[PDB]
Amino acid sequence: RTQSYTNSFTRGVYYPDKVFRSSVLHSTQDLFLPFFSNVTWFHAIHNPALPFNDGVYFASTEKSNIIRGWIFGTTLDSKTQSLLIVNNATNVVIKVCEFQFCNDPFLDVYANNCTFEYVSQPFLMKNLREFVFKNIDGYFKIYSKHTPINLERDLPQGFSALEPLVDLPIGINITRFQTLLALHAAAYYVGYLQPRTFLLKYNENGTITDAVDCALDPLSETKC
């Protein structure tokens, strides 16, 4: 692939808890994305599994839905149980077991006591698609936000909040991940989460309008 490098540009926040609040300022000890961090503009044309360190910011600007599915696992060589996420058209297929064609699966779109399966609404929903993934206490949290934009060169500036959609209770051990490249170029943004102490501003509704990265600079420490 191609490794172009850019910046975070003041985004990567989400609602930490499913509790409503309004016109209040709240501080959460959580695992947000740092402000103005070092994200990679991956161009998938020529791909080993990237590590899963405490969370993935994963984003895509693809209009035509080239990026469809995801795989997770520890070894991902038909040796561990791993994980499989399939966005089969207007459905989601989740398998806790594996099939493991080879290292990069390339499913041809042209199992030893499986535990959990799932089916739901379609997973996907001038476009900036954002999925924050994390795995805490064996629970695979999924965040999403549809972001109409006007800039198609890098990560646009501004502020937006990511809402939770689907919660999973399984996954056990995940330390690798890889996007889907099934053919029937491409661009996916990825960032790494770290524990932070963000302070959030709520409007008259429960909408996160602004936030501060509490260890970015001493002015934000004063604001904290």
């Binding site: 309004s22 016109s23 209040v24 008259e204």
Partner: protein
């Protein structure tokens, strides 16, 4: 930092300097008198209508009786401070309807009946300058009987057992006392603070005032229009400086802000666990058996009692400081207003 401009006065064995003119300058001094009176219920704060928590709190003795006694003493002391500062005049004097006092314009400090609460222009500017807090000293529960709009701050303060009492004297009674003091001082002079109010023209009163500071009284009568113009310009300058700058009433703003944040911290102390497994008493009471829930409730009771004692001690120290400032303001009202003071910088 710089201490100031360097000056070297030309001292000599036979050289003296004597002024040939004067300026009349009017300054401003702001002094706090009283703060917010609060009363705290122990049972609704520590326990919140739980019978088991009340039974475990009954073993701790009489901490809450002396907390209530301390808060009631502070609340009585605030009314005593306000009555000591303002209620010094015996009769409510009134200004005559003809507003001519030798050429001095008192129209910005005398009341007008255009508004219901009869306050002057400068009193209106001072009342609009202090951005007050929530401060539910009125019938607050009528607004919180129906949960409307969003969550307020005084309403969540009220729901946890913290109650704000209204002051004994309303704002229009304090304005009436101030108007009586102005009507005494302009008309009678210093004679109303020592017995019966004896009238005198304002030019002859100001001649007495110049004669008190070592200047012969003929200087007034030959410069009456200039002195009246200087006083009017100084009053207009104070009005413009109060209308423009909003950073002069910081002492009263701090008086509001400290009593806001103390109650905010006292409300926020309920969310802590204090070493227990939950900050909510019902979850502790429903999850565990008798002995373990008694242990958790004892931990929560100790934490909430410590926070309440810290609040009461801070209120007592702030009440002592406010009482010292109120005594200073009472002395300044007695000496500067009801007479002429020879103490320099006072």
């Amino acid at each position: 930092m710089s201490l100031g401009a360097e000056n070297s006065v030309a001292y000599s064995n036979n050289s003296i300097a004597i002024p040939t003119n004067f300026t009349i300058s009017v300054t401003t001094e702001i002094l706090p008198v009283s703060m917010t009176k609060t009363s705290v219920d122990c049972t609704m704060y520590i326990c919140g209508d739980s019978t088991e928590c009340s039974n475990l709190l009954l073993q701790y003795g009489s901490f809450c009786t002396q907390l209530k006694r301390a808060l009631t003493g502070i609340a009585v002391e605030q009314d005593k401070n306000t009555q000591e500062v303002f209620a010094q005049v015996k009769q409510i004097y009134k200004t005559p309807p003809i507003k001519y006092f030798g050429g001095f314009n008192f129209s910005q400090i005398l009341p007008d009946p255009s508004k219901p609460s009869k306050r002057s222009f400068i009193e209106d500017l001072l009342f609009n300058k202090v951005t007050l807090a929530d401060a539910g000293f009125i019938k607050q529960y009528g607004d919180c009987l129906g949960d409307i709009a969003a969550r307020d701050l005084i309403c969540a303060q009220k729901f946890n057992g913290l109650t704000v009492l209204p002051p004994l004297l309303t704002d229009e009674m304090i304005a009436q006392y101030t108007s009586a003091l102005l009507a005494g001082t302009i008309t009678s002079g210093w004679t109303f603070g020592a017995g019966a109010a004896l009238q005198i023209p304002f030019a002859m009163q100001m001649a007495y005032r110049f004669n008190g500071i070592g200047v012969t009284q003929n200087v007034l009568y030959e410069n009456q229009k200039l002195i009246a113009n200087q006083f009017n310009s100084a009053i207009g300058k104070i009005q413009d400086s109060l209308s423009s700058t909003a950073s002069a009433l910081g002492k009263l703003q701090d008086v509001v802000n400290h009593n806001a944040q103390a109650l905010n911290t006292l409300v926020k102390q309920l969310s802590s666990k204090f070493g227990a497994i939950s900050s909510v008493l019902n979850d502790i009471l429903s999850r565990l058996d008798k002995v373990e829930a008694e242990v958790q409730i004892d931990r929560l009771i100790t934490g909430r009692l410590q926070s309440l004692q810290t609040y009461v001690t801070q209120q007592l120290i702030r009440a002592a400081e406010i009482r010292a400032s109120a005594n200073l303001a009472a002395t300044k009202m007695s000496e500067c207003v009801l007479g002429q003071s020879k103490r320099v910088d006072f």
